[PDB]
Amino acid sequence: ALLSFERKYRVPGGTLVGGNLFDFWVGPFYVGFFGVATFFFAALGIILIAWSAVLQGTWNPQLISVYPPALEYGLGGAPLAKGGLWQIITICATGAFVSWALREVEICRKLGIGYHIPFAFAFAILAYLTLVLFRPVMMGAWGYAFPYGIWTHLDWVSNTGYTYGNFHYNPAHMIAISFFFTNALALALHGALVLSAANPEKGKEMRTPDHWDTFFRDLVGYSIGTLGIHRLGLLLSLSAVFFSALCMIITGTIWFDQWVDWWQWWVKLPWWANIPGGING
């Protein structure tokens, strides 16, 4: 079934591979070659997880966990029962996500829109790839990657963080947090703003964009404008993830000691290091 306005847009073309071979839909979903690729990768991955479940000996989603090869395996293969399945599943994940991005590009070409969405999605993919591929490679083992289970991946975040003390002191992690919180703040504000203009006090006419520029200027003395806020949210979000990937790519590699002690470079600068009083003297 189709949205009332949909048919005009369901024309042939836009595919990157296969010509017309996969140029069709199932229900709402566009398929394409990368739709097919995504189904295969995803379905195999789920099947391998369903199997890796029996080898672990469980069926609760809150207990299923697919743990990577242990550190002693380095960057080599592993028996399925202890690391192999993770490794194949990771290949399947990567395959599915990249295939999902490339399918988004096909959809963009058919619809005559910009490529901003797959471009944005590629930041999430890169963050995933940082944790499971780039960091573990750079550190010499698959075992530093996180396991695929609901609670077990949180155990990993906690143990990884406390390996370096309070992980709050990672400076790239500080920047990342700041973008996350700023992004959510911006999202609240955009949401509320547009809705406040479109749903005014009872009985009144829809407000206009001039009203919402006036609102923000009355309030903080600036309005970024409607093109601006959309650029902004895109930038805050993508920057949050950029800094997240960065903060982990440097941890266990460039820096591997307690993050709190990194801040000593500042306090040990010669012009004030030896001056008595304060906290650090």
Ligand X SMILES: CC[C@H]1c2cc3[nH]c4c(c3C)C(=O)[C@H](C(=O)OC)c4c3nc(cc4[nH]c(cc(n2)[C@@H]1C)c(C(C)=O)c4C)[C@@H](C)[C@@H]3CCC(=O)OC/C=C(\C)CCC[C@H](C)CCC[C@H](C)CCCC(C)C
Ligand Y SMILES: CCCCCCCCCCCCCCCCCC(=O)OC[C@H](COP(=O)([O-])OCC(O)COP(=O)([O-])OC[C@@H](COC(=O)CCCCCCCCCCCCCCCCC)OC(=O)CCCCCCCCCCCCCCCCC)OC(=O)CCCCCCCCCCCCCCCCC
Ligand Z SMILES: COC1=C(OC)C(=O)C(C/C=C(\C)CC/C=C(\C)CC/C=C(\C)CC/C=C(\C)CC/C=C(\C)CC/C=C(\C)CC/C=C(\C)CC/C=C(\C)CC/C=C(\C)CCC=C(C)C)=C(C)C1=O
Sequence ranges of the binding site: 153, 173, 190, 216, 230
Angle, CA of 95, 50 and 99, to the nearest 5°: 15
Give 26's DSSP letter.
E
Amino acid in the structure at residue 100: W
End-to-end CA distance of the chain: 72
Q: For residue 257, give every residue at least 6 positions away whose Cβ sits within 8 Å of its Cβ, in sequence order, or none.
A: 164
Residues 6+ apart with CB under 8 A from 28: 1
Q: Which of residues 206-265 bind ligand X (CB under 6 A)?
A: 219-220, 237-238, 241
- Binding positions for ligand Z, 32-61, rule CB under 6 A: 35, 38-39, 42
Least distance CB 38 / ligand Z (angstroms): 5
Binding to other proteins, residues 233-252 (CB under 8 A): 233-238, 240-241
Site for ligand X in 87-106 (CB under 6 A): 89, 92-93, 96-97, 100, 104
Q: Strand, coil or helix: what is 83?
A: coil
Is 148 a binding residue for ligand CCCCCCCCC by CB under 6 A? The answer is yes
Among 58, 159, 214, 264, binds other proteins (CB under 8 A): 214
**Annotated binding-site residue numbers for a ubiquinone:** 216
- Of the candidates 38, 43, 30, 15, the one whose C-alpha atom is nearest the C-alpha of residue 97 is 38
Using rule CB under 6 A, residue 115 touches ligand X: no
Instruction: Classify 275 in phi/psi space as left (phi over 0), alpha (psi -120 to 50) or beta.
Output: beta
Q: How far apart are CA 68 and CA 13, in angstroms?
A: 41
Tell me which residue of 201, 228, 202, 224 sits closest to 213, measured CA to CA: 224
CB of 165 vs ligand Z, minimal distance in Å: 17
Distance CA 58, CA 51 (A): 10
Residue of 40, 119, 128, 255 interacting with ligand BCL (CB under 6 A):
128
* Region 14-43 residues binding other proteins, contact defined as CB under 8 A: 14, 20, 23-30
Mask for 26-65, x = binds ligand LDA (CB under 6 A)? -xx-------------------------------------
Q: How far apart are CA 48 and CA 235, in angstroms?
A: 36
Q: Is residue 142 involved in binding ligand CCCCCCCCC (CB under 6 A)?
A: no
Region of 8-16, 63-71, 175-183, 269-277 interacting with ligand Z (CB under 6 A): 175-183
Of the candidates 234, 232, 240, the one whose C-alpha atom is nearest the C-alpha of residue 173 is: 240
Interface residues toward ligand Z, by CB under 6 A: 26, 29, 31, 35, 38-39, 42, 171, 174-175, 178, 182, 185-186, 189-190, 193-194, 212-213, 216, 220, 222-226, 229
Interface residues toward ligand X, by CB under 6 A: 38, 41-42, 45, 89, 92-93, 96-97, 100, 104, 117, 120-121, 123-124, 148-150, 153, 181, 184-185, 188-189, 192, 219-220, 237-238, 241
